[PDB]
Amino acid sequence: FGMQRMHYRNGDPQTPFQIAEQQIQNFQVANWLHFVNNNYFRQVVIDGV
């Protein structure tokens, strides 16, 4: 996208994908990055476990 290199400071509270989804205008890339950022396991009690 012709954007300046991300000067990512170590220990930043946000990850490079979390920054990039904000900085990127393209909807496909932004949507994929957002999925990667907010994708978690789901804790479910199945059959008592």
Binding site: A30, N31, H34, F35, N38, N39
Partner: protein
């Protein structure tokens, strides 16, 4: 009650912010709050109703958290959210109605419905969110025993009272001196009348006084004072004090002189306004003393002179009036006013569901009676029901 308010607040935020197309950064924290609410409310069984005609309803919560994987919320996400939001709103509405239709002589400020009692538990404290509304803010301040304040436009602080007092009278009711008034809502309208026009009074001056004691202390009140009482300036026929007969009042209106308005607190004059009409300010008061005089005009043209003879048969009766209107004020307790809809909401719920007359409020939430005898128990119950009504009014149109 803070928990119920937080439920209403988060549901309102979900309705007003979870819209198709909105970025997810605009609802990140709101979705976190909504999922917190769902987690806390899952697995709890509630019951509402049972009083009057309010139906018995049972509430179960087994919902799933809202998703967080969309950059922009789309139609499917909004529909999924609305499915659960409708149920939560219905639960909150029923809790609010069940709490509004109840009252208790002892501990009237404490929750009265089983649902609100259960919500008062510690486990539900996680759903607290932000308490920014005026009524919830005053609720929290009162619980902390801090300052409370409600701003009212035209506060309904005066119980309805339309009456007259006769200081001079006789069975014929043809030579009367006295004062007739109407106190209603936020307006006092008083008029002192004398049939002889102070022909035989000392210095040709007749004094009139009108004391209106408010049931609560008002502060920073903006008031309008006008030099006539339009309500007692036309001919009328009034029943006697005992109702035996009727008497004729035929006012001719003069200018009240030596007008004094005293706004008193604990019997100490806090504000005093002499011969000043229009917009005035009372910073802190609980009683209004209006003093005025009927002064026989020292000089009269023949048309004026013919009106006021020195003998008995007075055809025209000299009247001087004042009109006071509280446009805006601040009170520590709750009152009905012109702009708010809380009294209407509570009365409407009770009338719609035919709630039997309880032991605290007068039948049909009669505001005249309530503000006439605004006891501390009634004040606590009224604050509770008004807070619940405000909480319900952010979900139900």
């Amino acid at each position: 009650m803070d928990v119920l308010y937080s439920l209403s607040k988060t549901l309102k935020d979900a309705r007003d912010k979870i819209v198709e197309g909105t970025l997810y950064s605009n609802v990140s924290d709101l979705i976190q709050q909504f999922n917190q609410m769902i987690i806390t409310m899952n697995g709890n069984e509630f019951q509402t109703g049972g009083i009057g005609n309010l139906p018995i309803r049972n509430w179960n919560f087994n919902f799933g958290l809202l998703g967080t994987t969309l950059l922009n919320l789309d139609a499917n996400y909004v529909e999924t959210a609305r499915n659960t939001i409708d149920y939560f709103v219905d639960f909150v509405d029923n809790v609010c109605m069940d709490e509004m239709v109840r009252e208790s002589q002892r501990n009237g400020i404490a929750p009265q419905s089983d649902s609100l009692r259960k919500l008062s538990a510690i486990k539900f404290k996680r759903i607290n969110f932000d308490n920014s509304s005026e009524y919830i803010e005053n609720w929290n301040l009162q619980n902390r025993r801090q300052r409370t304040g409600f701003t009212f436009h035209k506060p309904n602080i005066f119980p309805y009272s339309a009456s007259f007092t006769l200081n001079r009278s006789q069975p014929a009711h043809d030579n009367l001196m006295g004062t007739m008034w109407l106190n209603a809502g936020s307006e006092i309208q008083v008029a002192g009348f004398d049939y002889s026009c102070a022909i035989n009074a000392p210095a040709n001056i007749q004094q009139f006084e009108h004391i209106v004691p408010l049931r609560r202390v008002l502060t920073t009140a903006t008031i309008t004072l006008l030099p006539d009482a339009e309500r007692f300036s036309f001919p009328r026929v009034i029943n006697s004090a005992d109702g035996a007969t009727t008497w004729f009042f035929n006012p001719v209106i003069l200018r009240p002189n030596n007008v004094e308005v005293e706004f008193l607190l604990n019997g100490q004059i806090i504000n005093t306004y002499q011969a000043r009409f229009g917009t005035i300010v009372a910073r802190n008061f609980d009683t209004i003393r209006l003093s005025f005089q009927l002064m026989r005009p020292p000089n009269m043209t023949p048309a004026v002179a013919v009106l006021f003879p020195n003998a008995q048969p007075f055809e025209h009766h000299a009247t001087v009036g004042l009109t006071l209107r509280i446009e805006s004020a601040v009170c520590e307790s709750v009152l009905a006013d012109a702009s708010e809809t809380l009294l209407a909401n509570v009365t409407s719920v009770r009338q719609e569901y035919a709630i039997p007359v309880g032991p605290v409020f007068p039948p049909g939430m009669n505001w005249t009676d309530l503000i006439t005898n605004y006891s501390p128990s009634r004040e606590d119950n009224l604050q509770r029901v008004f807070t619940v009504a405000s909480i319900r009014s952010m979900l139900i149109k």
